[PDB]
Design a protein around this motif. Structure first.
Motif, PDB file in Angstrom:
ATOM      1  N   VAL A 127      -3.137  23.823 -18.253  1.00  0.00           N
ATOM      2  CA  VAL A 127      -3.560  22.802 -17.365  1.00  0.00           C
ATOM      3  C   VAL A 127      -3.139  21.501 -17.964  1.00  0.00           C
ATOM      4  O   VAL A 127      -3.221  21.265 -19.202  1.00  0.00           O
ATOM      5  CB  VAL A 127      -5.126  22.859 -17.143  1.00  0.00           C
ATOM      6  CG1 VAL A 127      -5.560  21.533 -16.531  1.00  0.00           C
ATOM      7  CG2 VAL A 127      -5.616  24.240 -16.845  1.00  0.00           C
ATOM      8  N   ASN A 128      -2.466  20.707 -17.259  1.00  0.00           N
ATOM      9  CA  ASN A 128      -2.214  19.064 -17.632  1.00  0.00           C
ATOM     10  C   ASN A 128      -2.963  18.204 -16.973  1.00  0.00           C
ATOM     11  O   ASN A 128      -2.933  17.771 -15.886  1.00  0.00           O
ATOM     12  CB  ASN A 128      -0.464  18.918 -17.317  1.00  0.00           C
ATOM     13  CG  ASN A 128      -0.173  17.494 -17.550  1.00  0.00           C
ATOM     14  OD1 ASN A 128      -0.694  16.796 -17.113  1.00  0.00           O
ATOM     15  ND2 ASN A 128       0.804  17.393 -18.457  1.00  0.00           N
ATOM     16  N   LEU A 129      -4.164  17.835 -17.810  1.00  0.00           N
ATOM     17  CA  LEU A 129      -5.185  16.747 -17.537  1.00  0.00           C
ATOM     18  C   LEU A 129      -4.514  15.399 -17.457  1.00  0.00           C
ATOM     19  O   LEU A 129      -3.518  15.189 -18.564  1.00  0.00           O
ATOM     20  CB  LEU A 129      -6.402  16.719 -18.139  1.00  0.00           C
ATOM     21  CG  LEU A 129      -7.237  18.084 -18.215  1.00  0.00           C
ATOM     22  CD1 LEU A 129      -8.344  18.263 -19.298  1.00  0.00           C
ATOM     23  CD2 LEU A 129      -7.836  18.256 -16.874  1.00  0.00           C
TER      24      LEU A 129
ATOM     25  N   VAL B 103      -6.419  16.556 -12.818  1.00  0.00           N
ATOM     26  CA  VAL B 103      -5.339  17.797 -12.946  1.00  0.00           C
ATOM     27  C   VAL B 103      -4.211  17.267 -12.156  1.00  0.00           C
ATOM     28  O   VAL B 103      -4.255  17.603 -11.008  1.00  0.00           O
ATOM     29  CB  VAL B 103      -6.187  19.215 -12.444  1.00  0.00           C
ATOM     30  CG1 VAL B 103      -5.031  20.205 -12.570  1.00  0.00           C
ATOM     31  CG2 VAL B 103      -7.207  19.494 -13.258  1.00  0.00           C
ATOM     32  N   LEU B 104      -3.185  17.191 -13.045  1.00  0.00           N
ATOM     33  CA  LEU B 104      -1.895  16.691 -12.433  1.00  0.00           C
ATOM     34  C   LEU B 104      -1.188  17.933 -12.039  1.00  0.00           C
ATOM     35  O   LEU B 104      -0.918  18.210 -10.476  1.00  0.00           O
ATOM     36  CB  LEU B 104      -0.998  16.127 -13.633  1.00  0.00           C
ATOM     37  CG  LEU B 104      -1.114  14.596 -13.730  1.00  0.00           C
ATOM     38  CD1 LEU B 104      -0.181  14.229 -14.845  1.00  0.00           C
ATOM     39  CD2 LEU B 104      -0.874  13.627 -12.681  1.00  0.00           C
ATOM     40  N   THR B 105      -1.109  18.968 -12.838  1.00  0.00           N
ATOM     41  CA  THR B 105      -0.253  20.385 -12.538  1.00  0.00           C
ATOM     42  C   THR B 105      -1.099  21.414 -13.096  1.00  0.00           C
ATOM     43  O   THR B 105      -2.056  21.026 -13.736  1.00  0.00           O
ATOM     44  CB  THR B 105       1.088  20.288 -13.065  1.00  0.00           C
ATOM     45  OG1 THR B 105       0.987  20.322 -14.492  1.00  0.00           O
ATOM     46  CG2 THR B 105       1.605  19.068 -12.428  1.00  0.00           C
TER      47      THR B 105
ATOM     48  N   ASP C 138       8.986  21.900 -17.914  1.00  0.00           N
ATOM     49  CA  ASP C 138       9.121  21.631 -19.210  1.00  0.00           C
ATOM     50  C   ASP C 138       8.500  20.104 -19.668  1.00  0.00           C
ATOM     51  O   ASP C 138       8.461  19.935 -20.833  1.00  0.00           O
ATOM     52  CB  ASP C 138      10.657  21.636 -19.689  1.00  0.00           C
ATOM     53  CG  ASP C 138      11.409  23.133 -19.777  1.00  0.00           C
ATOM     54  OD1 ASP C 138      10.782  23.718 -19.316  1.00  0.00           O
ATOM     55  OD2 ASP C 138      12.330  23.079 -20.677  1.00  0.00           O
ATOM     56  N   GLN C 139       8.693  19.442 -18.403  1.00  0.00           N
ATOM     57  CA  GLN C 139       7.900  17.969 -18.804  1.00  0.00           C
ATOM     58  C   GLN C 139       6.230  18.241 -18.882  1.00  0.00           C
ATOM     59  O   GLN C 139       5.756  17.622 -19.882  1.00  0.00           O
ATOM     60  CB  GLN C 139       8.035  16.849 -17.466  1.00  0.00           C
ATOM     61  CG  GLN C 139       9.247  15.893 -17.628  1.00  0.00           C
ATOM     62  CD  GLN C 139       9.133  15.090 -16.382  1.00  0.00           C
ATOM     63  OE1 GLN C 139       8.446  14.683 -15.890  1.00  0.00           O
ATOM     64  NE2 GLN C 139      10.704  14.864 -16.253  1.00  0.00           N
ATOM     65  N   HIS C 140       5.745  18.900 -17.895  1.00  0.00           N
ATOM     66  CA  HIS C 140       4.308  18.902 -17.821  1.00  0.00           C
ATOM     67  C   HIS C 140       3.354  19.962 -18.784  1.00  0.00           C
ATOM     68  O   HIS C 140       2.305  19.718 -18.960  1.00  0.00           O
ATOM     69  CB  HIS C 140       4.274  19.166 -16.168  1.00  0.00           C
ATOM     70  CG  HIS C 140       4.121  17.867 -15.443  1.00  0.00           C
ATOM     71  ND1 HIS C 140       5.156  17.368 -14.852  1.00  0.00           N
ATOM     72  CD2 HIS C 140       2.974  17.118 -14.960  1.00  0.00           C
ATOM     73  CE1 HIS C 140       4.910  16.323 -14.169  1.00  0.00           C
ATOM     74  NE2 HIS C 140       3.533  15.992 -14.323  1.00  0.00           N
ATOM     75  N   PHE C 141       4.321  21.096 -19.142  1.00  0.00           N
ATOM     76  CA  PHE C 141       3.424  22.100 -20.156  1.00  0.00           C
ATOM     77  C   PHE C 141       4.349  22.317 -21.282  1.00  0.00           C
ATOM     78  O   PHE C 141       3.858  22.898 -22.195  1.00  0.00           O
ATOM     79  CB  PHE C 141       3.625  23.389 -19.398  1.00  0.00           C
ATOM     80  CG  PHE C 141       2.963  23.266 -17.896  1.00  0.00           C
ATOM     81  CD1 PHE C 141       1.447  22.764 -17.823  1.00  0.00           C
ATOM     82  CD2 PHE C 141       3.556  23.421 -16.728  1.00  0.00           C
ATOM     83  CE1 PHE C 141       1.193  23.047 -16.523  1.00  0.00           C
ATOM     84  CE2 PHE C 141       3.134  23.290 -15.616  1.00  0.00           C
ATOM     85  CZ  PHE C 141       1.813  23.078 -15.486  1.00  0.00           C
TER      86      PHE C 141
HETATM   87  C1  LIG Z   1       1.605  16.226 -19.074  1.00  0.00           C
HETATM   88  O1  LIG Z   1       2.188  15.715 -17.912  1.00  0.00           O
HETATM   89  C2  LIG Z   1       2.579  14.227 -18.187  1.00  0.00           C
HETATM   90  C3  LIG Z   1       3.623  13.802 -17.125  1.00  0.00           C
HETATM   91  O2  LIG Z   1       3.609  12.404 -17.140  1.00  0.00           O
HETATM   92  C4  LIG Z   1       3.600  14.406 -19.489  1.00  0.00           C
HETATM   93  O3  LIG Z   1       3.807  13.079 -19.752  1.00  0.00           O
HETATM   94  C5  LIG Z   1       5.001  12.934 -20.211  1.00  0.00           C
HETATM   95  O4  LIG Z   1       5.737  13.667 -21.082  1.00  0.00           O
HETATM   96  C6  LIG Z   1       7.042  13.797 -21.272  1.00  0.00           C
HETATM   97  C7  LIG Z   1       7.402  14.637 -22.314  1.00  0.00           C
HETATM   98  O5  LIG Z   1       6.822  14.284 -23.610  1.00  0.00           O
HETATM   99  C8  LIG Z   1       7.516  12.318 -21.631  1.00  0.00           C
HETATM  100  O6  LIG Z   1       8.931  12.298 -21.561  1.00  0.00           O
HETATM  101  C9  LIG Z   1       6.988  11.272 -20.723  1.00  0.00           C
HETATM  102  O7  LIG Z   1       7.286   9.990 -20.678  1.00  0.00           O
HETATM  103  C10 LIG Z   1       5.814  11.283 -20.269  1.00  0.00           C
HETATM  104  N1  LIG Z   1       5.254  10.697 -19.327  1.00  0.00           N
HETATM  105  C11 LIG Z   1       4.107   9.831 -18.947  1.00  0.00           C
HETATM  106  C12 LIG Z   1       3.536   9.090 -17.817  1.00  0.00           C
HETATM  107  O8  LIG Z   1       3.196   9.634 -19.888  1.00  0.00           O
HETATM  108  C13 LIG Z   1       2.471  14.851 -20.903  1.00  0.00           C
HETATM  109  O9  LIG Z   1       3.394  14.982 -21.975  1.00  0.00           O
HETATM  110  C14 LIG Z   1       1.954  16.269 -20.311  1.00  0.00           C
HETATM  111  N2  LIG Z   1       0.862  16.436 -21.400  1.00  0.00           N
HETATM  112  C15 LIG Z   1       1.233  17.035 -22.612  1.00  0.00           C
HETATM  113  C16 LIG Z   1      -0.054  16.792 -23.667  1.00  0.00           C
HETATM  114  O10 LIG Z   1       2.351  17.222 -23.163  1.00  0.00           O
END
Ligand SMILES: *[C@@H]1O[C@H](CO)[C@@H](O[C@@H]2O[C@H](CO)[C@@H](O)[C@H](O)[C@H]2NC(C)=O)[C@H](O)[C@H]1NC(C)=O
Ligand SMILES: *[C@@H]1O[C@H](CO)[C@@H](O[C@@H]2O[C@H](CO)[C@@H](O)[C@H](O)[C@H]2NC(C)=O)[C@H](O)[C@H]1NC(C)=O
Ligand SMILES: *[C@@H]1O[C@H](CO)[C@@H](O[C@H]2O[C@H](CO)[C@@H](O)[C@H](O)[C@H]2NC(C)=O)[C@H](O)[C@H]1NC(C)=O
Ligand SMILES: CC(C)CCC[C@@H](C)[C@H]1CC[C@H]2[C@@H]3CC=C4C[C@@H](O)CC[C@]4(C)[C@H]3CC[C@]12C
Ligand SMILES: CC(C)CCC[C@@H](C)[C@H]1CC[C@H]2[C@@H]3CC=C4C[C@@H](O)CC[C@]4(C)[C@H]3CC[C@]12C
Ligand SMILES: CC(C)CCC[C@@H](C)[C@H]1CC[C@H]2[C@@H]3CC=C4C[C@@H](O)CC[C@]4(C)[C@H]3CC[C@]12C
Ligand SMILES: *[C@@H]1O[C@H](CO)[C@@H](O)[C@H](O)[C@H]1NC(C)=O
Ligand SMILES: *[C@@H]1O[C@H](CO)[C@@H](O)[C@H](O)[C@H]1NC(C)=O
Ligand SMILES: *[C@@H]1O[C@H](CO)[C@@H](O)[C@H](O)[C@H]1NC(C)=O
Ligand SMILES: *[C@H]1O[C@H](CO)[C@@H](O)[C@H](O)[C@H]1NC(C)=O
Length: 953
Positions: free
Chosen positions: A704-706, A712-714, A66-69
């Motif tokens: 893909v989370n660039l 590519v993070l994840t 739910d963070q990364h996608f």
């Molecule tokens: C890709 O993953 C990154 C992981 O950091 C996401 O960045 C986070 O997004 C969450 C939810 O919006 C926030 O709570 C964090 O503060 C963000 N962290 C950073 C370090 O920026 C990112 O949202 C993901 N990509 C997309 C486009 O959603």
């Protein structure tokens, strides 16, 4: 130490019964002061907050996803079937004679089109936003997610093959093959589509696109259900999925999605009524389960309140003396029954209120059943106390205050034991990962403690006032204007002891009945021990709901007609160097890639769908990325000009960008680190057209989370579970997916440059709910063992019982519990958190059955074991029966109308088994086994009671 508490509670009882109204005031004040905190109650009905442990693995995996996608979209499905419509045949060209279903008629599809296009343009008023919410505002658009339109929203249905164009659906052409000609209809396009849904030119003499209007391919399992294999023409059910964008629990856009979902349901109910003979409509919104759980929670409050009315009414007219037909209204204890129930409800409200003061978030499903179990425990104490006070003959010229003191001092250690045992059992039942059952257990635990504290002060003061209003020759609740007269006040022996003295105790303790009963209970224990093994571990859906729900019909259809379960994403956590050749060789399933790679392993897993619960080989962004990067015309760079060495898309057909994506390859194509990091952001933002059908934006845009710089993070690989129908299926599917993911990560972690904390985990939306059932049995057995410990410990300490006495209690508790689990396995009650907290409550409660009889057998002076057993049976068996059993049963037998299968199964049936086995053991088996192997006479145990009665008399 027993007689020490006897002396204390004698003193306390006297001191309370002497000052009734002051103690009533001093006892009501804190109850109101604690129970006024119910206005702070934050009633949360959402399933993820109630039924998932926020510190479990599944929740950490969900949090990472739910963070990364972003979160998982909200699915509003409709499964239509025409049952009475007869199958027909079609002599199609390019294919054999296919037998079509009744549901795949043209008029039915035009009716589904009408519905689909009506639901597209559906609009609702949003009082928080003060405008009309259109679908485009909230709909999940995979292509073009920023500035979407109504024709860009994820609507998966059969009619997506015709892009919801009514002209293309009624369209017919003339095709000649091998000399012979035939009329090609929509059936030919449908079949050619269902075979290969990633086509932009149909091969049936029609330039008809197969992809959906929003621009992604619709796989047949999402559009049609009821077929088996690749025989799509025999599909019995059509599906119409509306995927809305899910947002976190605190987003003001979630109210918008829920408003539209409510309007969807209203429109679908209207559509269901309009089409009666034609379709058999079943449907659900994402809000449906949360709305059907909370509908029936407020509809069975009459059926719940009746339980406490009936317990009041029984306790009221089961302590009233019915000897003469002139003083029944003076003997009948309406005030005491009312007062006792009022005191218990006071205790329950005090508990709920105290827990709401600390901002603990409950649900009306939790604050419904708390009073029931707390009252079923708390009423027995008051009943037994008033019975003892009734039976205890007053000494000559002794005042009522000392008599109430003496009666309380007599029965207070037993009630302290019961209350402590039950409170401890509840607070050990409050170790469950499920926050709902945890809140339930903690509230119930405190409620029982405050129940005891109120019974000792408020109820004793109330009994003192009732005794006064009786002895003054006034009526019960029709009193204070009516001290008129009665016949002689004190009357002879009762009917309860009459029966238990002349009918039961001689019959139960016959020469024969002791042998028969003992044999029969050992046989029952053996059968129960055998049958406990065939217990079903899992709380499936269709139990949370009523039996009149529109969701049950939907779940019947979703189980019967659906061809794939939920999609499982094999998420790859941080620390994979995807750029390296050795890196991407172990993920892909093309020519040159490693054997038993990521996608090859999932493919081979899906080859056996019964062992590993996967039906579809995983989609792969890297496989389609190295497919995209071919010397074909998919990605091309401008040979010269202002945009030199920049991406010209597949759409443009100019000569300026004739240069291929990369150099002239000599075998299996693999992009370099710089080439990979440069060309991946192009792939993921490329819409699949006729020219280049391979494109990232359709499927792999969000997979893909660039990073900010193109690392590519994840990444997630999307497979599909086989249709999961039971709770056991969901649990086995999770287990099997996790085993495969562990096997995958084991091989991916041997690649040069991979972080050792790298992990592949299978995240499905229903992981958090069906993960607990992997390890509920060890947790449960540990919990029930930890609940059997303090019972025995405090039973041997507080009551002051000997070794044989404690072990007879323990043996009887274990016997009741094993019998409950055996009958649980027979009746068809499953094992879960709800059944477990009921069984922990049973461990606590069964003490009320066994302890009273065992004590009153221990504190006996009769010569022979049989005489002591008869005395114990008659006196305390009658008290325990009339109190415990018959203040449980009239309360339980009313929950048989609850209508909610959850309560109707886990709080009627299970409590009925617990009560009846408690009764049977601690009134048939315990007297007999006490008459056989009971503890020896202790003269000092009874004779020192008189150094504790008279000394503080
Ligand atoms: C890709 O993953 C990154 C992981 O950091 C996401 O960045 C986070 O997004 C969450 C939810 O919006 C926030 O709570 C964090 O503060 C963000 N962290 C950073 C370090 O920026 C990112 O949202 C993901 N990509 C997309 C486009 O959603
Ligand atoms: C991932 O592996 C790639 C190679 O596939 C690494 O790219 C090389 O990095 C080394 C170290 O500086 C350079 O000398 C090479 O020129 C790079 N290209 C090669 C060798 O193909 C990349 O550094 C790795 N990722 C890391 C370590 O972060
Ligand atoms: C649905 O498809 C039909 C058929 O392609 C569209 O009808 C038009 O399509 C032609 C080519 O785009 C147009 O030149 C014609 O005006 C018309 N063709 C025929 C034979 O009617 C239709 O526009 C599409 N739906 C919408 C509303 O875009
Ligand atoms: C047999 C019954 C009547 C015993 C009493 C049960 C009471 C305590 C239960 C039943 C219904 C519950 C109430 C229903 C919903 C609300 C509205 C909310 O904004 C404040 C809490 C409040 C008011 C609940 C408090 C607890 C409650 C009042
Ligand atoms: C102590 C008990 C009786 C209080 C209420 C227990 C309730 C909340 C329990 C019993 C059965 C459980 C439900 C059964 C399964 C599902 C389906 C799932 O897709 C969402 C969660 C949901 C809906 C569960 C949520 C929690 C649940 C509703
Ligand atoms: C304490 C024990 C001995 C008796 C408990 C009360 C009885 C009525 C309970 C205990 C076990 C229960 C039975 C166990 C399971 C079945 C099989 C099912 O196909 C019909 C109902 C039936 C037959 C149940 C009916 C109710 C039941 C018989
Ligand atoms: C219907 O199709 C089935 C499946 O091939 C076939 O076995 C059967 O003969 C067909 N019946 C008719 C009436 O054509
Ligand atoms: C909102 O939608 C309804 C659909 O019945 C429409 O009649 C109404 O005009 C709309 N609201 C506004 C602001 O026009
Ligand atoms: C195609 O054949 C049908 C059936 O014979 C006929 O009605 C129609 O006129 C034909 N169309 C063309 C383009 O010849
Ligand atoms: C996957 O896991 C093991 C690692 O223990 C691996 O060696 C083998 O290929 C697979 N094992 C099984 C049982 O399939």
């Amino acid at each position: 130490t027993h007689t020490l508490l006897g002396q204390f509670f004698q003193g306390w009882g006297t001191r309370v019964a002497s000052w009734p109204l002051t103690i009533l005031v001093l006892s009501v004040i804190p109850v109101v002061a604690l129970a006024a905190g119910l206005v702070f109650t934050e009633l949360t009905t959402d399933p993820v907050e109630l039924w998932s442990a926020p510190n479990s693995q599944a929740r950490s995996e969900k949090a990472f996803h739910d963070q990364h996608f972003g979160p998982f979209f909200r699915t509003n499905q409709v499964i239509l079937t025409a049952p009475n419509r007869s199958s027909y045949r079609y002599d199609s060209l390019l294919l054999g004679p296919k037998n079509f279903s009744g549901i795949l008629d043209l008029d039915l599809l035009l009716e589904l089109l009408e519905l689909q296009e009506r639901l597209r343009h559906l609009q609702v008023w949003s009082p928080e936003a003060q405008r009309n919410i259109s679908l485009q505002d909230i709909c999940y658009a995979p292509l073009n997610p920023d500035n979407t339109s109504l024709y860009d929203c994820c609507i998966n249905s059969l009619l997506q093959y015709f892009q919801n164009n009514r002209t293309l659906l009624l369209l017919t052409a003339n095709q000649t093959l091998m000399g012979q000609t035939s009329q090609v209809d929509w059936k030919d396009h449908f079949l050619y589509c269902a075979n290969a849904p990633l086509t932009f030119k149909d091969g049936t003499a029609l330039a008809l696109s197969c992809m959906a209007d929003y621009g992604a391919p619709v796989f047949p399992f999402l559009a049609i259900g009821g077929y088996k294999g690749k025989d799509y023409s025999e599909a019995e059910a059509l599906i119409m999925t509306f995927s809305l964008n899910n947002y976190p629990a605190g987003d003001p856009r979630l109210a918008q999605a829920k408003l539209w979902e409510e309007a969807f349901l209203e429109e679908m109910r209207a559509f269901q009524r309009r089409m009666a003979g034609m379709f058999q409509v079943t449907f659900m919104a994402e809000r449906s389960l949360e709305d059907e759980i909370n509908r029936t929670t407020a509809e069975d409050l009459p059926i719940f309140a009746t339980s406490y009315i009936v317990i009041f009414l029984y306790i009221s007219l089961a302590l009233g003396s019915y000897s003469s037909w002139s003083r029944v209204m003076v003997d009948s204890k309406a005030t005491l029954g009312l007062g006792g129930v009022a005191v218990v409800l006071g205790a329950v409200m005090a508990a709920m209120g105290f827990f709401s003061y600390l901002g603990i978030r409950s649900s009306l499903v939790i604050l419904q059943v708390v009073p029931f179990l707390v009252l079923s425990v708390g009423a027995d104490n008051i009943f037994i106390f008033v019975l003892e006070y009734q039976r205890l003959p007053r000494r000559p010229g002794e005042p009522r205050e000392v008599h109430i003191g003496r009666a309380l001092g007599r029965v207070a250690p037993s009630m302290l034991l019961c209350s402590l045992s039950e409170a401890i059992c509840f607070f050990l039942g409050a170790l469950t990962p499920m926050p709902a059952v945890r809140t339930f257990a903690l509230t119930s635990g405190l409620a029982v403690i405050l129940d005891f504290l109120l019974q000792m002060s408020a109820f004793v003061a109330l009994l003192s006032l009732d005794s006064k209003r009786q002895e003054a020759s006034r009526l019960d609740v029709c009193c204070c204007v009516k001290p008129q007269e009665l016949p002689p006040p004190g009357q002879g022996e009762g009917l309860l002891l009459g029966f238990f003295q002349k009918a039961y105790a001689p019959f139960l303790l016959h020469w024969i009945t002791r042998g028969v009963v003992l044999l029969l209970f050992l046989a029952l224990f053996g059968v129960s021990l055998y049958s406990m093994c065939h217990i079903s571990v899992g709380l499936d859906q269709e139990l949370a709901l009523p039996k009149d729900s529109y969701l049950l019909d939907y779940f019947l259809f979703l189980n019967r007609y659906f061809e794939v379960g939920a999609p499982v994403y094999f998420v790859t956590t941080l620390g994979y160097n995807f750029s390296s050749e050795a890196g991407m060789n172990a993920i892909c399933s093309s020519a040159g890639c490693n054997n038993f790679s990521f996608t090859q392993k999932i493919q081979y897993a899906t080859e056996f769908p019964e062992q590993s619960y996967l039906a579809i080989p995983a989609s792969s962004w890297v496989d389609d990325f190295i497919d995209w990067l071919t010397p074909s015309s998919c990605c091309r760079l401008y040979i010269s000009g202002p945009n030199k060495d920049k991406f010209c898309p597949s759409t443009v057909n100019s000569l300026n960008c004739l240069k291929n994506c990369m150099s002239i390859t000599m075998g299996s194509v693999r992009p370099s680190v710089e080439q990979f990091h440069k060309y991946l952001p192009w792939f993921l933002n490329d819409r699949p057209n006729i020219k280049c059908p391979k494109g990232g934006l359709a499927a792999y845009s969000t997979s893909v989370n660039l990073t900010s710089d193109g690392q590519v993070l994840t990444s997630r690989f999307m497979a599909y579970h086989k249709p999961l129908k039971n709770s056991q299926d969901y649990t086995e599917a999770l287990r099997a997916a996790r085993e495969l993911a562990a096997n995958i990560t084991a091989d991916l972690r041997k690649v040069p440059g991979t972080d050792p904390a790298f992990e592949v985990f299978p995240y499905t939306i229903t992981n958090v709910f069906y993960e607990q059932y992997l390890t509920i049995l060890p947790e449960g057995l540990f919990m029930l063992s930890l609940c059997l410990v303090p019972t025995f410990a405090v039973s041997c300490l507080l009551l002051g019982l000997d070794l044989r006495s404690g072990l007879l209690n323990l043996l009887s508790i274990v016997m009741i519990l094993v019998d409950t689990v055996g009958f649980m396995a027979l009746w068809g009650i499953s094992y879960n958190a709800v059944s477990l907290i009921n069984l922990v409550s049973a461990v606590g409660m069964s003490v009320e059955f066994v302890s009273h009889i065992t004590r009153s057998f221990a504190i006996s002076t009769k010569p022979t074991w049989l005489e002591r057993a008869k005395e114990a049976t008659i006196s305390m068996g009658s008290a325990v029966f009339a109190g415990v059993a018959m203040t449980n049963l009239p309360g339980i037998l009313v929950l048989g109308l609850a209508k909610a299968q959850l309560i109707q199964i886990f709080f009627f049936r299970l409590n009925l088994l617990i009560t009846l086995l408690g009764l049977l053991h601690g009134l048939v088996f315990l007297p007999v086994i006490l008459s056989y192997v009971g503890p020896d006479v202790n003269p000092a145990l009874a004779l020192e009671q008189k150094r504790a009665e008279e000394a503080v008399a």
